[PDB]
Design a protein around this ligand. Structure first.
Ligand SMILES: [Mg+2]
Length: 324
């Protein structure tokens, strides 16, 4: 909290966003990720101490924390459509349990509270978001966990939502440690939404975390792309180099272009297509397959990029580098 877990320099490399996909990445790449990512819902604390699987991969923060004891923990917290009731205090015991549990892991924790704050589908009110960020920031201090938990305000940076509407969601610089964004199909509006989020973070003097990232609508194993965000029709064959150059190269270039502020990313490395929420016939959008290990060229290029010196990977000095 209050900036102590923001690295002075470098970009935290983390992976997500379910236990099994993270394990598959770690095994396939022969690496311990520097950060690992799961989700919990505030209403039930689903996924905190036992399995939760709502079709977007299995979440189990206890299992994940035990499997990656010397990695940073990144946790998205959904309001489950109830941010106003959360702001009114109906989930305060759950908030304390969440914060106390995460602090008990004695490691850097990056907490994406009410993540995708401005995604209309989340049913948030601006007041509920602003109030609950203030509450959680202050409660972290009251519980004595300010050295352990860093509070991320993550926007959706989603092209179909009009730009210019971020201010209403902002709780104040006193209450936020990072601005976060989602990097999926930013090319659909010429990077306008992700650039707006970056510029907002920059203006506020906050570091930027790319909290959700994936080559959305691409399939790594199949080597295809679809222009259809709903159902992935009319798939087009791509070479592996094309897939790299179309999505991966501009993703890493975005970090470089925003190197004054970018201090972390979570790459979602998963066969989305195999997870029932994201599966055929695609009732909640078309996602694809983002496993870098599913193509030799993608895997090699991924490994080569993240090995570079601007990136913070796993080592014995990781926690110190992250301010822990
Ligand atoms: Mg912090």
């Amino acid at each position: 909290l209050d900036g102590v877990l923001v690295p002075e320099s470098g970009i935290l490399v983390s992976v997500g966003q379910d236990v099994d996909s993270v394990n598959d990445y770690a095994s396939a790449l022969g690496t311990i990720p520097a950060g690992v990512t799961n989700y919990v819902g505030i209403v039930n604390l689903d996924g905190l101490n036992s399995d939760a699987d709502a079709g977007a991969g299995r979440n189990n923060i206890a299992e994940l924390a035990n499997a990656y004891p010397t990695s940073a923990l990144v946790v998205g917290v959904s309001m489950n459509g109830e941010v106003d009731a959360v702001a009114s205090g109906r989930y305060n015991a759950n908030i304390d349990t969440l914060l106390n549990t995460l602090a008990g892991y004695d490691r850097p924790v990056y907490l994406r509270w009410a993540y995708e704050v401005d995604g209309p589908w989340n049913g948030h009110s601006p007041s509920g978001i602003v109030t609950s960020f203030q509450y959680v920031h202050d409660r972290i201090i009251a519980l004595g966990h300010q050295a352990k938990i860093s509070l991320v305000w993550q926007v959706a940076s989603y092209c179909p939502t009009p730009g210019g509407q971020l201010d209403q969601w902002w709780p104040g610089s006193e209450y936020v440690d990072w601005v976060g964004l989602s990097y999926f199909a930013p090319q659909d509006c010429n990077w306008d939404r992700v650039n707006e989020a970056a510029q907002f973070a920059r203006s506020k003097g906050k570091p930027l975390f790319l909290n959700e990232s994936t080559p959305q609508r691409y399939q790594v194993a199949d080597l295809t792309y679809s222009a259809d965000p709903a159902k992935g029709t009319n798939r087009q064959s791509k070479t592996s180099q094309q897939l790299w150059d179309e999505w991966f190269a501009p993703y890493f270039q975005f970090m470089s272009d925003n190197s004054d502020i970018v201090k972390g990313f979570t790459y979602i490395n998963a066969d989305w297509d195999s997870q029932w929420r994201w599966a055929a016939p695609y009732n909640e959008g078309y996602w694809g397959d983002s496993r870098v290990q599913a193509n030799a060229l993608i895997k090699s290029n991924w490994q080569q990029e993240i090995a570079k010196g601007q990136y913070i990977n796993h080592s014995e000095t990781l926690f110190e580098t992250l301010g822990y």
